[PDB]
mmCIF file of all heavy atoms in Angstrom:
data_model
loop_
_atom_site.group_PDB
_atom_site.id
_atom_site.type_symbol
_atom_site.label_atom_id
_atom_site.label_comp_id
_atom_site.label_asym_id
_atom_site.label_seq_id
_atom_site.Cartn_x
_atom_site.Cartn_y
_atom_site.Cartn_z
ATOM 1 N N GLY A 1 0.816 -1.195 0.000
ATOM 2 C CA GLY A 1 0.000 0.000 0.000
ATOM 3 C C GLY A 1 0.853 1.249 0.000
ATOM 4 O O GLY A 1 0.440 2.291 -0.513
ATOM 5 N N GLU A 2 2.049 1.158 0.573
ATOM 6 C CA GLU A 2 2.950 2.288 0.767
ATOM 7 C C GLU A 2 2.304 3.400 1.579
ATOM 8 O O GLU A 2 2.762 4.546 1.547
ATOM 9 C CB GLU A 2 3.450 2.835 -0.575
ATOM 10 C CG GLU A 2 4.192 1.809 -1.422
ATOM 11 C CD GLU A 2 5.590 1.505 -0.900
ATOM 12 O OE1 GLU A 2 5.825 1.642 0.320
ATOM 13 O OE2 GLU A 2 6.456 1.129 -1.713
ATOM 14 N N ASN A 3 1.255 3.071 2.326
ATOM 15 C CA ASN A 3 0.732 3.989 3.321
ATOM 16 C C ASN A 3 1.813 4.294 4.347
ATOM 17 O O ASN A 3 2.533 3.400 4.799
ATOM 18 C CB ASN A 3 -0.501 3.383 3.985
ATOM 19 C CG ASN A 3 -1.461 2.780 2.973
ATOM 20 O OD1 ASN A 3 -1.265 1.656 2.514
ATOM 21 N ND2 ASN A 3 -2.488 3.532 2.605
ATOM 22 N N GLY A 4 1.929 5.565 4.714
ATOM 23 C CA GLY A 4 3.003 5.949 5.605
ATOM 24 C C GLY A 4 4.389 5.747 5.037
ATOM 25 O O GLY A 4 5.359 5.725 5.799
ATOM 26 N N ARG A 5 4.515 5.570 3.723
ATOM 27 C CA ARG A 5 5.786 5.211 3.108
ATOM 28 C C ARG A 5 5.963 5.961 1.795
ATOM 29 O O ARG A 5 4.977 6.305 1.133
ATOM 30 C CB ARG A 5 5.853 3.703 2.825
ATOM 31 C CG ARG A 5 5.815 2.836 4.058
ATOM 32 C CD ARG A 5 5.472 1.400 3.707
ATOM 33 N NE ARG A 5 5.443 0.545 4.892
ATOM 34 C CZ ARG A 5 4.393 0.405 5.698
ATOM 35 N NH1 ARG A 5 3.301 1.140 5.520
ATOM 36 N NH2 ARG A 5 4.454 -0.433 6.723
ATOM 37 N N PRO A 6 7.204 6.211 1.389
ATOM 38 C CA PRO A 6 7.462 6.825 0.089
ATOM 39 C C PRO A 6 7.281 5.822 -1.035
ATOM 40 O O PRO A 6 7.733 4.673 -0.922
ATOM 41 C CB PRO A 6 8.918 7.291 0.202
ATOM 42 C CG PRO A 6 9.528 6.355 1.159
ATOM 43 C CD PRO A 6 8.449 5.993 2.142
ATOM 44 N N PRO A 7 6.620 6.198 -2.126
ATOM 45 C CA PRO A 7 6.376 5.234 -3.204
ATOM 46 C C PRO A 7 7.623 4.959 -4.034
ATOM 47 O O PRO A 7 8.382 5.867 -4.377
ATOM 48 C CB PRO A 7 5.299 5.920 -4.050
ATOM 49 C CG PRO A 7 5.554 7.363 -3.849
ATOM 50 C CD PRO A 7 6.022 7.508 -2.425
ATOM 51 N N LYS A 8 7.817 3.686 -4.366
ATOM 52 C CA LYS A 8 8.935 3.262 -5.190
ATOM 53 C C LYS A 8 8.802 3.836 -6.600
ATOM 54 O O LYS A 8 7.702 4.162 -7.041
ATOM 55 C CB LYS A 8 8.998 1.745 -5.252
ATOM 56 C CG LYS A 8 9.155 1.079 -3.906
ATOM 57 C CD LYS A 8 9.426 -0.403 -4.074
ATOM 58 C CE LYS A 8 9.473 -1.136 -2.753
ATOM 59 N NZ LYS A 8 8.114 -1.360 -2.206
ATOM 60 N N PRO A 9 9.904 3.969 -7.331
ATOM 61 C CA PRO A 9 9.801 4.314 -8.750
ATOM 62 C C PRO A 9 9.294 3.159 -9.602
ATOM 63 O O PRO A 9 9.374 1.989 -9.233
ATOM 64 C CB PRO A 9 11.236 4.683 -9.115
ATOM 65 C CG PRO A 9 12.053 3.832 -8.220
ATOM 66 C CD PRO A 9 11.300 3.753 -6.925
ATOM 67 N N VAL A 10 8.765 3.525 -10.768
ATOM 68 C CA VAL A 10 8.239 2.593 -11.764
ATOM 69 C C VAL A 10 9.315 1.984 -12.654
ATOM 70 O O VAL A 10 10.302 2.638 -12.997
ATOM 71 C CB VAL A 10 7.180 3.303 -12.614
ATOM 72 C CG1 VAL A 10 6.607 2.364 -13.631
ATOM 73 C CG2 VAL A 10 6.092 3.832 -11.728
ATOM 74 N N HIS A 11 9.130 0.707 -13.001
ATOM 75 C CA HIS A 11 9.953 -0.025 -13.959
ATOM 76 C C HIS A 11 9.052 -0.619 -15.037
ATOM 77 O O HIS A 11 7.927 -1.047 -14.754
ATOM 78 C CB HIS A 11 10.782 -1.119 -13.321
ATOM 79 C CG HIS A 11 11.701 -0.638 -12.251
ATOM 80 N ND1 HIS A 11 13.069 -0.738 -12.360
ATOM 81 C CD2 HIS A 11 11.462 -0.047 -11.061
ATOM 82 C CE1 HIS A 11 13.633 -0.230 -11.282
ATOM 83 N NE2 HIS A 11 12.680 0.194 -10.476
ATOM 84 N N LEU A 12 9.569 -0.674 -16.269
ATOM 85 C CA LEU A 12 8.835 -1.136 -17.444
ATOM 86 C C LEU A 12 9.649 -2.121 -18.266
ATOM 87 O O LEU A 12 10.865 -1.979 -18.386
ATOM 88 C CB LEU A 12 8.449 0.017 -18.348
ATOM 89 C CG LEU A 12 7.784 1.201 -17.679
ATOM 90 C CD1 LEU A 12 7.800 2.385 -18.585
ATOM 91 C CD2 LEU A 12 6.376 0.835 -17.352
ATOM 92 N N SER A 13 8.965 -3.107 -18.848
ATOM 93 C CA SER A 13 9.572 -4.096 -19.734
ATOM 94 C C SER A 13 8.724 -4.283 -20.982
ATOM 95 O O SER A 13 7.499 -4.323 -20.892
ATOM 96 C CB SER A 13 9.735 -5.423 -19.039
ATOM 97 O OG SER A 13 10.556 -5.279 -17.899
ATOM 98 N N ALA A 14 9.366 -4.416 -22.144
ATOM 99 C CA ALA A 14 8.638 -4.551 -23.400
ATOM 100 C C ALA A 14 9.294 -5.523 -24.374
ATOM 101 O O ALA A 14 10.521 -5.589 -24.475
ATOM 102 C CB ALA A 14 8.509 -3.196 -24.085
ATOM 103 N N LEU A 15 8.450 -6.277 -25.084
ATOM 104 C CA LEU A 15 8.855 -7.244 -26.100
ATOM 105 C C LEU A 15 8.149 -6.895 -27.398
ATOM 106 O O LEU A 15 6.957 -6.587 -27.378
ATOM 107 C CB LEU A 15 8.463 -8.662 -25.718
ATOM 108 C CG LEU A 15 8.915 -9.222 -24.379
ATOM 109 C CD1 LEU A 15 8.367 -10.610 -24.195
ATOM 110 C CD2 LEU A 15 10.407 -9.250 -24.303
ATOM 111 N N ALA A 16 8.852 -6.996 -28.530
ATOM 112 C CA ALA A 16 8.217 -6.667 -29.806
ATOM 113 C C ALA A 16 8.778 -7.464 -30.979
ATOM 114 O O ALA A 16 9.951 -7.858 -30.992
ATOM 115 C CB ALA A 16 8.362 -5.180 -30.104
ATOM 116 N N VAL A 17 7.913 -7.682 -31.975
ATOM 117 C CA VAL A 17 8.244 -8.441 -33.179
ATOM 118 C C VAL A 17 8.155 -7.538 -34.404
ATOM 119 O O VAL A 17 7.124 -6.901 -34.628
ATOM 120 C CB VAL A 17 7.301 -9.643 -33.345
ATOM 121 C CG1 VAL A 17 7.731 -10.511 -34.491
ATOM 122 C CG2 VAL A 17 7.258 -10.442 -32.082
ATOM 123 N N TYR A 18 9.214 -7.516 -35.212
ATOM 124 C CA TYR A 18 9.321 -6.671 -36.396
ATOM 125 C C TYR A 18 9.349 -7.445 -37.705
ATOM 126 O O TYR A 18 9.749 -8.606 -37.764
ATOM 127 C CB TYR A 18 10.566 -5.796 -36.366
ATOM 128 C CG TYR A 18 10.427 -4.558 -35.553
ATOM 129 C CD1 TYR A 18 10.536 -4.575 -34.190
ATOM 130 C CD2 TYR A 18 10.165 -3.359 -36.174
ATOM 131 C CE1 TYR A 18 10.398 -3.429 -33.471
ATOM 132 C CE2 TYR A 18 10.025 -2.220 -35.468
ATOM 133 C CZ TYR A 18 10.142 -2.255 -34.119
ATOM 134 O OH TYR A 18 10.000 -1.093 -33.414
ATOM 135 N N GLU A 19 8.927 -6.753 -38.758
ATOM 136 C CA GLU A 19 9.087 -7.212 -40.131
ATOM 137 C C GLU A 19 10.552 -7.352 -40.524
ATOM 138 O O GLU A 19 11.427 -6.634 -40.040
ATOM 139 C CB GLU A 19 8.404 -6.256 -41.093
ATOM 140 C CG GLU A 19 6.924 -6.158 -40.891
ATOM 141 C CD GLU A 19 6.318 -5.042 -41.702
ATOM 142 O OE1 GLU A 19 7.061 -4.403 -42.474
ATOM 143 O OE2 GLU A 19 5.101 -4.796 -41.568
ATOM 144 N N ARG A 20 10.803 -8.309 -41.412
ATOM 145 C CA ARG A 20 12.139 -8.575 -41.932
ATOM 146 C C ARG A 20 12.744 -7.373 -42.649
ATOM 147 O O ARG A 20 12.077 -6.696 -43.434
ATOM 148 C CB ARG A 20 12.107 -9.773 -42.872
ATOM 149 C CG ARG A 20 11.623 -11.029 -42.193
ATOM 150 C CD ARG A 20 11.522 -12.184 -43.144
ATOM 151 N NE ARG A 20 12.844 -12.657 -43.514
ATOM 152 C CZ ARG A 20 13.563 -13.487 -42.769
ATOM 153 N NH1 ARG A 20 13.096 -13.919 -41.608
ATOM 154 N NH2 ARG A 20 14.761 -13.872 -43.176
ATOM 155 N N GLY A 21 14.018 -7.113 -42.357
ATOM 156 C CA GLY A 21 14.736 -5.960 -42.873
ATOM 157 C C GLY A 21 14.573 -4.674 -42.102
ATOM 158 O O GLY A 21 14.693 -3.593 -42.680
ATOM 159 N N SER A 22 14.300 -4.760 -40.824
ATOM 160 C CA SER A 22 14.103 -3.633 -39.922
ATOM 161 C C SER A 22 15.379 -3.345 -39.140
ATOM 162 O O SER A 22 15.954 -4.278 -38.564
ATOM 163 C CB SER A 22 12.964 -3.931 -38.958
ATOM 164 O OG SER A 22 11.789 -4.272 -39.669
ATOM 165 N N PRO A 23 15.880 -2.100 -39.079
ATOM 166 C CA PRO A 23 17.048 -1.830 -38.226
ATOM 167 C C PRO A 23 16.702 -1.751 -36.742
ATOM 168 O O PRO A 23 16.440 -0.685 -36.166
ATOM 169 C CB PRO A 23 17.565 -0.498 -38.772
ATOM 170 C CG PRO A 23 16.352 0.183 -39.271
ATOM 171 C CD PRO A 23 15.423 -0.889 -39.778
ATOM 172 N N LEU A 24 16.701 -2.932 -36.125
ATOM 173 C CA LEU A 24 16.324 -3.082 -34.725
ATOM 174 C C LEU A 24 17.123 -2.158 -33.811
ATOM 175 O O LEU A 24 16.569 -1.502 -32.910
ATOM 176 C CB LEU A 24 16.518 -4.538 -34.310
ATOM 177 C CG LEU A 24 15.774 -5.576 -35.150
ATOM 178 C CD1 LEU A 24 16.118 -6.965 -34.682
ATOM 179 C CD2 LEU A 24 14.284 -5.369 -35.097
ATOM 180 N N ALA A 25 18.438 -2.123 -34.012
ATOM 181 C CA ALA A 25 19.289 -1.274 -33.195
ATOM 182 C C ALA A 25 18.807 0.164 -33.207
ATOM 183 O O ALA A 25 18.708 0.808 -32.160
ATOM 184 C CB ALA A 25 20.727 -1.362 -33.691
ATOM 185 N N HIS A 26 18.504 0.693 -34.377
ATOM 186 C CA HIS A 26 18.050 2.068 -34.421
ATOM 187 C C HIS A 26 16.605 2.228 -33.992
ATOM 188 O O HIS A 26 16.175 3.358 -33.754
ATOM 189 C CB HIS A 26 18.256 2.613 -35.823
ATOM 190 C CG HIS A 26 19.684 2.581 -36.250
ATOM 191 N ND1 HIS A 26 20.701 3.063 -35.456
ATOM 192 C CD2 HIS A 26 20.276 2.089 -37.363
ATOM 193 C CE1 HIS A 26 21.856 2.887 -36.069
ATOM 194 N NE2 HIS A 26 21.625 2.301 -37.230
ATOM 195 N N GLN A 27 15.850 1.148 -33.861
ATOM 196 C CA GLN A 27 14.466 1.281 -33.429
ATOM 197 C C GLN A 27 14.275 1.178 -31.929
ATOM 198 O O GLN A 27 13.189 1.493 -31.445
ATOM 199 C CB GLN A 27 13.576 0.270 -34.129
ATOM 200 C CG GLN A 27 13.564 0.486 -35.607
ATOM 201 C CD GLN A 27 13.051 -0.693 -36.352
ATOM 202 O OE1 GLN A 27 12.879 -1.769 -35.789
ATOM 203 N NE2 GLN A 27 12.776 -0.502 -37.632
ATOM 204 N N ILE A 28 15.263 0.710 -31.177
ATOM 205 C CA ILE A 28 15.075 0.683 -29.724
ATOM 206 C C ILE A 28 14.922 2.092 -29.153
ATOM 207 O O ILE A 28 14.163 2.312 -28.196
ATOM 208 C CB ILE A 28 16.229 -0.060 -29.033
ATOM 209 C CG1 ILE A 28 16.281 -1.510 -29.485
ATOM 210 C CG2 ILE A 28 16.089 0.028 -27.550
ATOM 211 C CD1 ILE A 28 17.554 -2.193 -29.140
ATOM 212 N N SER A 29 15.666 3.056 -29.691
ATOM 213 C CA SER A 29 15.593 4.431 -29.207
ATOM 214 C C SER A 29 14.181 5.001 -29.214
ATOM 215 O O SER A 29 13.741 5.601 -28.229
ATOM 216 C CB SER A 29 16.517 5.312 -30.031
ATOM 217 O OG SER A 29 17.799 4.729 -30.102
ATOM 218 N N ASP A 30 13.476 4.888 -30.335
ATOM 219 C CA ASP A 30 12.113 5.404 -30.401
ATOM 220 C C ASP A 30 11.232 4.848 -29.296
ATOM 221 O O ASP A 30 10.523 5.594 -28.618
ATOM 222 C CB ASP A 30 11.503 5.087 -31.759
ATOM 223 C CG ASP A 30 12.258 5.727 -32.887
ATOM 224 O OD1 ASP A 30 12.976 6.712 -32.624
ATOM 225 O OD2 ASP A 30 12.134 5.258 -34.036
#
């Protein structure tokens, strides 16, 4: 509940599937 307590920061995780011939390295930034 974090009642009486400072709230922790948020963390996020994501998985994705791309079409063939996609520059994955340059697409992580977006």
